[PDB]
Amino acid sequence: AIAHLATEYVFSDFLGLRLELAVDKMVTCIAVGLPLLLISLAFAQEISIGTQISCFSPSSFSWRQAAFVDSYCWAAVQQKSSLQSESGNLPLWLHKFFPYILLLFAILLYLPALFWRFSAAPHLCSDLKFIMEELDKVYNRAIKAAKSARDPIVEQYLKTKKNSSHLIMKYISCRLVTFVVILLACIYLSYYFSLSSLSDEFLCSIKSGVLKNDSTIPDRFQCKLIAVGIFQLLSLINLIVYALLIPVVVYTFFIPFRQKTFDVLHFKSEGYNDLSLYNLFLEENISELKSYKCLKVLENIKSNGQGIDP
Amino acid sequence: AIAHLATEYVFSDFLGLRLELAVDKMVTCIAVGLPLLLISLAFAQEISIGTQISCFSPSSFSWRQAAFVDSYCWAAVQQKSSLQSESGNLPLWLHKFFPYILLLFAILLYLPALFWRFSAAPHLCSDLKFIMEELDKVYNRAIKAAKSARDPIVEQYLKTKKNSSHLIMKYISCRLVTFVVILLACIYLSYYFSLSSLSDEFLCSIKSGVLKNDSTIPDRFQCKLIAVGIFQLLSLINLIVYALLIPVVVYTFFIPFRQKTFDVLHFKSEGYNDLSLYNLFLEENISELKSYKCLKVLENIKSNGQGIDP
Amino acid sequence: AIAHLATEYVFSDFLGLRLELAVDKMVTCIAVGLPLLLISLAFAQEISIGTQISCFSPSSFSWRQAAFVDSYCWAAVQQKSSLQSESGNLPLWLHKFFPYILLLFAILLYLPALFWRFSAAPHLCSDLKFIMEELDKVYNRAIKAAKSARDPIVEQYLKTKKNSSHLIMKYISCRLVTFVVILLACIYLSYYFSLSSLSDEFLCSIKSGVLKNDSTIPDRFQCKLIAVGIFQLLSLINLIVYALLIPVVVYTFFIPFRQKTFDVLHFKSEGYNDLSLYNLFLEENISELKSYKCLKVLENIKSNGQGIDP
Amino acid sequence: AIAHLATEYVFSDFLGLRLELAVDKMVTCIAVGLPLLLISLAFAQEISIGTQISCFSPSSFSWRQAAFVDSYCWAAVQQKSSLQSESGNLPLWLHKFFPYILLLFAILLYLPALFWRFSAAPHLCSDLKFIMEELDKVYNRAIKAAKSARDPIVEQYLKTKKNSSHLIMKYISCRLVTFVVILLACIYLSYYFSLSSLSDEFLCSIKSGVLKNDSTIPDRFQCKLIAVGIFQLLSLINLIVYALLIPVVVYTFFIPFRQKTFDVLHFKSEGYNDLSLYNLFLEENISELKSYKCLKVLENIKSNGQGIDP
Amino acid sequence: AIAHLATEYVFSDFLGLRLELAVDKMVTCIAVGLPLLLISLAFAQEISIGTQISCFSPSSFSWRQAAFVDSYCWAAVQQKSSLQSESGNLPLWLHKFFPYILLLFAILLYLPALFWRFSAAPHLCSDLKFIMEELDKVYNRAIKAAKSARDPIVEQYLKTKKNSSHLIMKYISCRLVTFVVILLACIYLSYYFSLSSLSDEFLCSIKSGVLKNDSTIPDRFQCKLIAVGIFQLLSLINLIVYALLIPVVVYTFFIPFRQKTFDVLHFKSEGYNDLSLYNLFLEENISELKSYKCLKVLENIKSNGQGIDP
Ligand SMILES: CC(C)CCC[C@@H](C)[C@H]1CC[C@H]2[C@@H]3CC=C4C[C@@H](OC(=O)CCC(=O)O)CC[C@]4(C)[C@H]3CC[C@]12C
Ligand SMILES: CC(C)CCC[C@@H](C)[C@H]1CC[C@H]2[C@@H]3CC=C4C[C@@H](OC(=O)CCC(=O)O)CC[C@]4(C)[C@H]3CC[C@]12C
Ligand SMILES: CC(C)CCC[C@@H](C)[C@H]1CC[C@H]2[C@@H]3CC=C4C[C@@H](OC(=O)CCC(=O)O)CC[C@]4(C)[C@H]3CC[C@]12C
Ligand SMILES: CC(C)CCC[C@@H](C)[C@H]1CC[C@H]2[C@@H]3CC=C4C[C@@H](OC(=O)CCC(=O)O)CC[C@]4(C)[C@H]3CC[C@]12C
Ligand SMILES: CC(C)CCC[C@@H](C)[C@H]1CC[C@H]2[C@@H]3CC=C4C[C@@H](OC(=O)CCC(=O)O)CC[C@]4(C)[C@H]3CC[C@]12C
Ligand SMILES: CC(C)CCC[C@@H](C)[C@H]1CC[C@H]2[C@@H]3CC=C4C[C@@H](OC(=O)CCC(=O)O)CC[C@]4(C)[C@H]3CC[C@]12C
Ligand SMILES: CC(C)CCC[C@@H](C)[C@H]1CC[C@H]2[C@@H]3CC=C4C[C@@H](OC(=O)CCC(=O)O)CC[C@]4(C)[C@H]3CC[C@]12C
Ligand SMILES: CC(C)CCC[C@@H](C)[C@H]1CC[C@H]2[C@@H]3CC=C4C[C@@H](OC(=O)CCC(=O)O)CC[C@]4(C)[C@H]3CC[C@]12C
Ligand SMILES: CC(C)CCC[C@@H](C)[C@H]1CC[C@H]2[C@@H]3CC=C4C[C@@H](OC(=O)CCC(=O)O)CC[C@]4(C)[C@H]3CC[C@]12C
Ligand SMILES: CC(C)CCC[C@@H](C)[C@H]1CC[C@H]2[C@@H]3CC=C4C[C@@H](OC(=O)CCC(=O)O)CC[C@]4(C)[C@H]3CC[C@]12C
C-alpha cells in the first residue's frame, strides 16, 4: 500500500486565473501534504505489527484477562493515578496522540490558504478579469501602431490601488500565520524527537476498584508502545523539511516590497501597497496574453539588435 | 485512514446564483462538518484498540464465558438494576452514546439550512434572476450615456419589497435556531468534558436470572469503557470551535439591519424589511455583472481623480 | 462509518416538470429515509459489539459447544417448544426481526409514491406540457398589449378538467394510504418502545433430540439479545418524527379543496375536481415562465403603486 | 494481486507541447517506477507469510506472552541496549526500513522532474507556442513559393536565445541531480545486497524493567526477520536496472552540446546555450507541423532524385 | 473470483492508424497476457488452502512455536545451511519464486512492443498520415477519370524508402527478441514441469543460534510446499501455448520479405527494405479509404466480368 500512498500524495495533485502565487501554493502543498504522508507511512502494514501497545501479562492469566490488561493500559495512558515511568506522563500522551498532532499541524497550515480563497481571491479575481482584458486592448493597439510604423483608464485605475493597502494586509497576515505555525511545529517536532527512546516503556496497574485487593494480580505490568520508534524517526523527516520551508516563507514577505512614466509592460514593486500585489498577480497572469508575448518578443529583439522600440 | 478523513472533511467541499450568504454557508459547513470529523477520528484504527468495553473475567472462565460478560455488560450499561458506579448511571449512557450525540448535533445544525433551501431560496431565486437582468439593462444604458457624454420598473419593484417583511422572518428564524442549537451543544460538551475520567469505570453483574444462585460467578465484574478518554478530549476541541462560532452567528443578526434619491449602485440596509435581504443578496451577486464592474471602476476613478461621475 | 451514513442519508439527495408537490415529496423522503438511517445506525461498528446474542455456557463446554448454544438459541427464538421468558415469545420475535420491520415500513411508505409515478404522472405530464406552452403564448400576448398600451382554448380545456375528478381519486388515495401506514407504524413503535428492557433476556434449551438424555448439559441456558436496548432507543426517535409527520399529511388532504370571470394568473381551488390538482401543479410550475414573472411583477407594482393593470 | 501490480506499474502509464524530452521522461519513469513495483512485490500475499518477524518463545509462555515478545523485539530492533547479533545493529535497521528506503529513492528521483515542471516548463511552453506558430507561417510561404516555381523575426528572436544560457543551467542541474541520486542508490543497493543472509537473525531480550529479575523469562530470544531474503533478492534487480540507466543519463549531458546562413529546417547544436535546448525541444515538436512534413518530404526527394530544392 | 479473472484477462481487451500489425499485436497479447492469468489462477481462493507452506511441529510445541517453525522454514528455503532435500536446493527456490518468474516473462515479452511504440511508431505514424492522404487524392482522381471515361510525389517518396532500411532493423530486432524470450521461457517451463512432484517436500532445521543446544526441539521438521502441484500443472499449460506461438513468430520474419511500372493499388514485398514495412502497414490501413474500396470493387468486377479497368 506504500506505493499507493506515493501515488496519492506525491505523484498526483491534490488540495482560469492564477489567484495564488506559485511559490505560496507550492509551500502550502508541502507544508500540508507532508504530515499526511508521514501519518500514512507510520501505520503502513509493511511496517506495522498490528497493535499500538503490548503488556506482559503473567502466564496464569487467561487470553481475555491479558486482552483486558492491554486495553486498560491503553486507556490508563491518560490516567495519572495508574501510571509510572522513568519520567512524567507527558511523553506517553504525545506517543499516543502523535497521529492527531500531525493532523492538527496539517489543518492549521491549510487554514491561511482557505481564508485567502474565502476573503481575498473573489475581489482580486474580479479586478484581474477587468484589468487583463483592458490591457489586451492597449497591447493590440500598440502592436498595430508598431506594425504600421515599422512593418488610459487602466493607468488611472491601477494608480488608485496604491492608495488602498487593503489586500496587502490580508496577504501578509496569511503569510505571517503560516510562518508562525511552521515555527511552532518545528519546536514541537524537535522536542518530540529529543525524547528518550525508552520513554515508550511504562508501568501500568489495573488495581483500581474491586481488583484492588486481588492478590493474584501483579502490582505492575510492563507495557511498551510499539510504534514510538517509528514516530520519532518520521518526526526527524518532518522537522528537516519544515526547517527548509522557513527561509522560503520569509522570502515571501519581501517579494512584494522589493524582490518580485507609467509602464504597461514592466510590472514593478511599489511598496506596502495593493498595487505591489496586483503587480505580482498580473506578472503571473499577463504572460497568457498573446499580445503581451508579441511585445515582449519585440522588446527582447530590441534589447539585442534591431531597434524595434516596444 | 486519518489522512483520508482529512481529504474528505477538510481539503474538499461537501454538504448559478448565490442563494446563501457566504458567512452563513461557512458557519454551516464548520458547525455541521466538525462533529462528523471528530466522530471519524474517535474510531480511527490508528487510535482504536478494537473494542469499546473490556471486563476482567476470572481465570476459571472459558473464552466464551468472558465474551459473554463483555457483551452482557455492554447491554447492562442501559439497565439500572445491574450497574454500580462512583456516580449515577447517566455518565455511562453518555459514554456509550457519544457518537450518536455528536451525530444529532450535526443533523440539527443542518436542518435550518435545508429549510432555507426548501422554503425561501426558490422565491428569492426567481426574484434575483429578474432583478439582475433588468439592472444589467439600466447599467448598460448608463454606460452608453457616460461614454457618449465623456468619451424605473426595478426601483418601483424593489420599493415594494420593503413593505413585505416576508423573507426576513424566514431568514432570522433560521439564524436564531442555529444560534440556539450551537448554544445547547456548548452546554452539553462542557458538561461532558467536566465528567471525571474514572467515570469510564463501572461495576457490572450478570446474576440476573438462572445465574443468580451460581456460586462460581463473582458478584461484580470490573469493566472499563476504553474510548472515553478520547471522547472527552475531542469534546474539548468541539467546544472550543463552537464557542468561536457564537460571536459570528450573533453578528449575522445585525448584518441586515445595520452592518451589511434611490441609488442603483449602492445597496444599503433598510431596516427589518425584505429589501435589506435583497440588498445583501444582490451585493453578493451584482459583482458578476460586467456592466456593474465598469461603473464601479469609473466610481473608483472619480473618487480618486478625474470626475467621471457614475 | 457513521459519518458516511450521514453523508449518504442526510447531506445528499436520494430516492423537467415538477410532477410531485414539494410537501408530498418532502414527507416521502423523511418517511422512507428515516427508517433506513436508523437501521444503519443500529448496527454501526461504533455501537455494535459484534454479535446479536450471547448465552452463558458452562465452563466445561468446549469453544465449539458454546458456539453451538449461541447458534441454536438464535434459531430457537422462533421455536416455542424450546423457549421460556418472563412474558410470551412475541417480544423475542420482535427483537430479532426489528431490522426487517423497519425495512417493511420504509417499503410500504414508498409504494404510494411509486404508484403515483406509475399511474398518474404520465398523464399529468402530457397535460402540463401542453397547458404551460399555451399559457406562455397568452402571457406574451398580454405583455405586448400592456407594453403597447402603457409603455381561449386553454380556458375551454381547463373547464373540462373540473368535470373529470379522475386524478383527484388517484391523488387522495395515495395520500390516504400514506396516512394509514404512518399511523400503523406509530402504533407498533410505541408498543415496541413500551416493552420491558429485560424482555431481551430469555431461557433457552438445547435438549431436543439425542441431547435430551445428556446429564452433562444444563437444562436452561441464560441468553441475552445484546442490541435490544439500542433498538428500543431508536424506536423512540422514529415514533417522534412520524408523530410530527401526521399533522403534515392530514393538511395535504385539505390543500386541494381549500387551502392551496376566468383568471389565467390566479390559480385557485375548485373543489373535489381535477382542476384543483391542475391548479396546484400549475402553481408549482408556472413560476418558471419568464412571461408569468413579468406579469406578476406588474401586478405587484399595481398592488402598491402605479396602476399598470395586469 | 501480482497481476494487478503489473497492470498498474508496467502495462499502463502513470506519473499539447512536449515539454520534456522523450529520453528524459523515459528514464524518469523507470527510475521512479521500479522501486514502487519492487516494494509492492516484496509484500505480495503470494510471497508473504503474514508477518515480518517471529521469535521462538518458550513452551510455557501463553499466547499473549509470545505475542508480546514478537511486538517488543520488533520495537527493540531500534534499541541498542536490548539487541545482540553476529554484527552491528545497522543491518537490522536496514532490514526493517527497506520499504521506506526504496520509497525515499523513488521520491528523490521524482523531484528533479517536478522542479523542471515547476521552474522551467512554463517559460519554455510560452516560447515554443510562439516560435512554432511563426515557423508555420515561414514554411507555408516557402511551400507556396516552391509550388509556384516548380508546380525574419524568428531568426532574430532565436539568435537572442544563444546569448541567454538561462534554461541550460536549469536543465543540466536537473540531469546532474538525477545522476547523483541514481549513483548513491547503486552504492546503497550493492551494499545491502552484500550483507550476510544470516544478518536477518538476531538475539532479543525483554528484561528491561520490572521483568529484569524474573527468572521464568529466558535471557535471550531467537528472532528472525522473515522477508529479508526477498528484500536482498529484489535489491539485486533494482541495482541491475539502475546500473543500466547510468550510461543513458550521462548521454543526456552531451545530447545538447554535440550529439542531439541560418537554417529553419535543420535544428542543430550551438554549444552551452539555450538555443541548443530550443533546438532539441523544437525537433521533438516541429514534426507535428503539416508544412514541415511537406518540406521534409521534398528535401528527401531532392536528396534522392528530382532537384526540388527545399 | 475465477469468473472475474476470465472477464478481466480473456473477455476484455487490455495492454487512429494501426501502428502495429494485427498478428504481432495478437501474439503480444497472448504471450504477455497468459502468464498473468496463470499467476492469478494459481492463488485463486477456489483452489488455495490459505498457506504456501506447512511444517509438522511436535505436539508439545505451543501454537506460536509452531507458527515460528513455518515462518522460519519459509525463510530457510533460501538458506543452504539449514536445508536438506532429496535433491539440491534449486527446486525449492523455483517453487517459492514461481510467481515472480512468470511475472518476469510477462514483462520481458512486453518490452519489445513498448520499444516499438517508443522508438519506431512516431516516425511511421507521421509518414502514414502523409502517404495515405496523398494516396486518397490519387485514387479520387482515378475514380473521376474512370467515371468520366466509362460512366507522382508519392511514387517518388516511396521509392526513397527502399533505400533506407532504417525501420526494418528496428522491426526485425523486436521480432527476434520476442522469439528468443519465448524460446527461453519454453526451456524453463519444460524443466520446471519435469521436476519430481515430491521436490515440494524438504527437511528444515531451526537449530541455528541459541536454539542449537535445545534438546526439546527436533533436529529436522518435515515441511511441504502446498501449491507446487498446481504450479507444475499450470506450467504445462503455459508451455503448450508458447510452443504454439513459436511457429507464428517465425512466420513474422518472412511476412515482409516474401509472404505478406509502379502500382498504387497492389502493395507488395520489396526485400529487406523499409518499403516492405510501409507496404505491410499501408495494406493494413489503406482499406479504410473510401476511394480505395471503390477502385478495389471495380478491380474485382473487372477480374470477373465487365472490363472496367482500374
Ligand atoms: C533522510 C533525510 C535526511 C533525507 C533528506 C530529506 C528528504 C526526506 C526530503 C527532502 C525533500 C522532501 C520532499 C520535498 C517535496 C515534496 C513534495 C510534496 O508534494 C507536493 O508538494 C506536490 C506538488 C504538486 O504535485 O504540485 C510531498 C512531500 C515531498 C515529496 C518531500 C518529502 C521529503 C523529502 C524527500
Ligand atoms: C483531534 C485533533 C484535531 C486535535 C488534537 C489535540 C491534542 C493532540 C491535544 C489537545 C489536548 C492536549 C493535552 C492536554 C493535557 C495534557 C496533559 C499534560 O500533562 C502533564 O503536564 C503531565 C505532567 C506529569 O506527568 O505530572 C501535558 C499536555 C497534555 C498531554 C496535552 C497534549 C496535547 C493534547 C492531547
Ligand atoms: C488543541 C486546540 C486548543 C487548538 C485550537 C483549535 C483547533 C483544533 C481548531 C481551530 C480552528 C478549527 C478549524 C476551523 C475550520 C475548519 C474547516 C472545516 O471545513 C470547512 O468548513 C470546509 C470549508 C470549505 O471547504 O469551503 C472543518 C473543521 C476545521 C478544519 C476546524 C478544525 C479545528 C480547528 C483547527
Ligand atoms: C440516533 C440519534 C439521531 C439520536 C440519539 C439520541 C440519544 C443520544 C438520546 C435519546 C434518549 C436519551 C436518553 C433517555 C434516557 C436517559 C436516562 C437518564 O437516566 C438518569 O437520569 C439516571 C439517573 C441515575 O443514575 O439514577 C439520563 C438521560 C438519558 C441517558 C438520555 C441520554 C441521551 C439519549 C440516549
Ligand atoms: C432525541 C430527540 C427527542 C430529539 C428530537 C428529534 C430529532 C432526533 C429529529 C427531529 C427532526 C428530525 C429530522 C427531520 C428531517 C430529516 C431529513 C431526512 O432527509 C431528508 O428528508 C432529505 C431531504 C432532501 O435532501 O431533500 C433524514 C432524517 C432527518 C434528518 C430527521 C432525523 C431526526 C430528527 C433530527
Ligand atoms: C422481510 C420483510 C420485507 C418482511 C418482514 C415481516 C416480518 C417482520 C413479519 C412476518 C411474519 C410475522 C410473524 C408471524 C408470526 C408471529 C408469531 C406470533 O406469536 C405469538 O403470538 C406468540 C405468543 C406466545 O408466546 O404464546 C406473534 C407475531 C409473529 C412473531 C409475527 C411478527 C412479525 C413477522 C415476523
Ligand atoms: C533476473 C535479472 C538478472 C533479469 C534482467 C533484468 C530485468 C529484471 C530488468 C531488465 C529491464 C527491466 C525493465 C525495464 C523497463 C521497465 C518499464 C517500467 O515502466 C515504464 O517505464 C513505463 C513506461 C511507459 O508506460 O511509458 C517498469 C519497470 C520495467 C518493466 C523494468 C523491470 C525490470 C527489467 C525487466
Ligand atoms: C520515510 C522515508 C521518506 C524516509 C526514511 C529515512 C530512513 C530510512 C533513514 C532516516 C534515519 C536513518 C537512520 C539514522 C540512524 C541510524 C543508526 C546508525 O546505527 C549505527 O551506526 C549502529 C552501529 C552499532 O551497531 O554499534 C546506522 C544508520 C541508521 C540506522 C539510519 C538508517 C536510515 C534511516 C532509518
Ligand atoms: C489442457 C490443455 C492440453 C488444453 C489445450 C490448451 C489450452 C489450455 C489453450 C489453447 C489455446 C489457449 C488460449 C489462446 C488464446 C487466449 C487469448 C488470450 O487473450 C487475448 O489474447 C486477448 C485478445 C483480445 O482480446 O484482443 C488469453 C489466453 C487464451 C485464452 C489462451 C488460454 C489457454 C488456451 C485455451
Ligand atoms: C521480481 C522479478 C521481476 C524478478 C525475479 C527474479 C528471480 C526469479 C531470480 C533472480 C535471482 C535468481 C536466483 C539466484 C540464485 C540462485 C541460487 C542457485 O542455487 C543453486 O545452484 C543451489 C545448488 C545446491 O543446491 O547446491 C540456483 C538459481 C537461483 C535459485 C536463482 C533462481 C531465480 C532467481 C530467484
UniProtKB/Swiss-Prot annotation, chains A, B, C, D, E:
Ion channel involved in a variety of physiological functions such as blood pressure regulation, apoptotic cell clearance and oogenesis. Forms anion-selective channels with relatively low conductance and an order of permeabilities: nitrate>iodide>chlroride>>aspartate=glutamate=gluconate. Can release ATP upon activation through phosphorylation or cleavage at C-terminus. May play a role as a Ca(2+)-leak channel to regulate ER Ca(2+) homeostasis. This is Pannexin-1. It is a multi-pass membrane protein. Homoheptameric. The chain holds residues 2 to 362 of 426 of the full protein. Disulfide bonds join C55-C223, C73-C204. Belongs to the pannexin family. Residues 1-29, 117-175 are cytoplasmic.
